[PDB]
Amino acid sequence: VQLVESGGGLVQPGGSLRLSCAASGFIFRSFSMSWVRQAPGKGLEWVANINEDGGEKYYVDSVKGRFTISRDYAKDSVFLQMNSLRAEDTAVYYCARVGPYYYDSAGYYRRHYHFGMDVWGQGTTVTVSS
Amino acid sequence: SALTQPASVSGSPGQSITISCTGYNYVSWYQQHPGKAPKLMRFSGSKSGNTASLTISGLQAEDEADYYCSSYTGSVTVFGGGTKLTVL
Amino acid sequence: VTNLCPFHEVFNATRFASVYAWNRTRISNCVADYSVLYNFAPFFAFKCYGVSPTKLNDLCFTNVYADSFVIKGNEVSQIAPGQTGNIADYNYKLPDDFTGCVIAWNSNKLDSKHSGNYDYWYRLFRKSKLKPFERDISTEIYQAGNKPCKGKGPNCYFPLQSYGFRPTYGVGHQPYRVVVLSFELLHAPATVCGP
């Protein structure tokens, strides 16, 4: 299993970028994918999420519909198009898989899965500045 | 519905330390060291109503990190403020 | 009219089977009176495909198949021809030319024990998409990576997950009982008709 992010860099405000998440070592048609960013000096913050088929795309309110996240079964990768970049958007971005590998507490006998982000890529840095 | 976490918790080596996360059935915990991506999570988890708790037994030097609690329910995930654990 | 079709068991069973192992009952050699169906429960998502419900008493079929199960509120809409998701893809899939009816009603009172009614499971993973009208009761460990699994592991997952039904949830997460009636007429004379 391996996730690699690419496509980040320096951009002026108001531009449009594309972040690519390449997945390997696991079947890509069964795990929903999420994008989570972290600003330097701060904690993690959710950005976007998509199911396996991509028909259910959800975004945090702070991004409205400015970002567009999609996935394709052909190339087995995730992509995120970025529009209307702002000063508070510069961050390191990770793409993660929502896998039920997590087993919380003694509920293992009751067979209850806590869907978590088990595999995190190394992330790519997007710096929005002049 | 942002979660609530203590700013920082400190304790002696080898001591069991509890970290609380107050906000709901799906809750996950992640550990993150500086310079590395967060990793999904001696560690015992528990839940009670709107509160979750993670207890660490046998604290060591390598356990210095920041721990985050998330609530992946439906299709929207919310992260907490982040608890930076301190190892004496 | 002396042999009413046994709809008193399908819509009034003590407990329903899990969605991944949905129960199938065959109704034949009886007189079908659908007018009493509304008396069984306050139907929420009554929906018929390929047949007008108001004429259900005026038609005949060789056999009827009732597929009963329990799902969540969000997954009720997945029970429809040409639909995709979790239930419609890996648990219970209807044919694209489906003919019959679907009856879904809330069961918050009977399937919520305040401590988690974990007896209702659904299939989370599968190697391929389910063929129409097929049951996959297999419980083999699912492999996500390339390494051998022979059991649960970091990338080796149990295909079934248990619903966490509780009465405190919203209408979207409270359990819903679903009965799908499929009407079939292959060759034999229709032993099922109206009054």
Author numbering:
A (entry chain H): 2 to 131
B (entry chain L): 2 to 24, 32 to 49, 63 to 109
C (entry chain A): 329 to 523
What does the paper say about this structure?
BA.2.86, a recently described sublineage of SARS-CoV-2 Omicron, contains many mutations in the spike gene. The characteristic spikes on the surface of coronaviruses are formed by trimers of S, linked to the virion through transmembrane helices at the C terminus. S is made up of an N-terminal S1 domain, responsible for attachment to the host receptor angiotensin converting enzyme 2 (ACE2),2 and a C-terminal S2 domain, which through conformational rearrangement executes fusion of host and viral membranes, allowing entry of viral RNA into the host cell cytoplasm, initiating the infectious cycle. The RBD is positioned at the top of S and can adopt a range of conformational states, from a fully exposed “up” conformation, able to interact with ACE2, to a more hidden “down” conformation.
XBB-7 is more cross-reactive than XBB-2 and XBB-6, with little reduction in potency for RBDs bearing mutations at 455 and 456; however, its potency is reduced ∼8× against BA.2.86. We determined the structure of its Fab in complex with the BA.2.86 S trimer by cryo-EM at 3.6 Å resolution. This antibody belongs to the IGHV3-7 gene family and also binds at the back of the RBD in a similar orientation to XBB-2 but is shifted toward the right shoulder. Only three hypervariable loops form contacts with the RBD, H3, H1, and L1. RBD residue 456 contacts a proline from H3, leading to 4-fold reduction in potency for the F456L mutation in EG. However, the further adjacent mutation, L455F, seen in XBB.1.5.70, compensates for this, so there is little impact on potency. The RBD is rather mobile and not well ordered; however, it is possible to model and refine the structure of the RBD and it is clear that the numerous mutations and the deletion of residue 483 do not introduce major changes (RMSD compared with BA.2.75 RBD for 188 RBD Cα 0.56 Å). Although the ΔV483 deletion has been seen before in SARS-CoV-2 sequences, the deletion of residues at the edge of the ACE2 binding surface of RBD has been very rare. Such a change might cause epistatic knock-on effects, reshaping the ACE2 interaction surface in a more profound way than simple amino acid substitution. However, we find that the structural changes are minor and localized; the presence of a disulfide bond close to ΔV483 appears to lock the loop, limiting the propagation of conformational change.
